[PDB]
Design a protein around this ligand. Structure first.
Ligand code: NAG
Lengths: 48, 48
């Protein structure tokens, strides 16, 4: 501080900048038919 | 809301394909051959 004053950079001109931000709030609702996935069409697999 | 068990469309026809006019393998004729080899010189025949 030179005496009682500090050196500061104060803006003399300005603009407005836009910034994007994507926030995920949802996801694909995956549903699994466990019986069709594990055993397909096969009666012998569905029994087991 | 109930997701029911997966179905598969039933087949409406049967497709059966075989190569026609193929000769008989004659496996019995080679097995019934009276010149039977020993395990030392076991014999191989390929049927196709
Ligand atoms: C601010 O900057 C813009 C572009 O850089 C310029 O057109 C404008 O004249 C400037 N204004 C001042 C007060 O310096």
């Amino acid at each position: 501080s030179v005496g009682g004053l500090y050196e500061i950079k104060i803006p003399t001109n300005f603009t407005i900048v836009g910034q994007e931000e994507f926030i995920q709030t949802n996801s694909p609702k995956v549903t699994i038919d466990c019986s069709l996935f594990v055993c397909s069409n096969y009666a012998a697999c569905h029994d087991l | 809301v109930y997701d029911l068990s997966g179905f598969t469309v039933k087949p409406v026809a049967t497709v059966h394909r075989r190569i026609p006019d193929l000769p008989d393998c004659d496996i019995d004729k080679w097995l019934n051959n009276f010149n039977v080899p020993s395990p030392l010189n076991w014999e191989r025949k390929i049927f196709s």
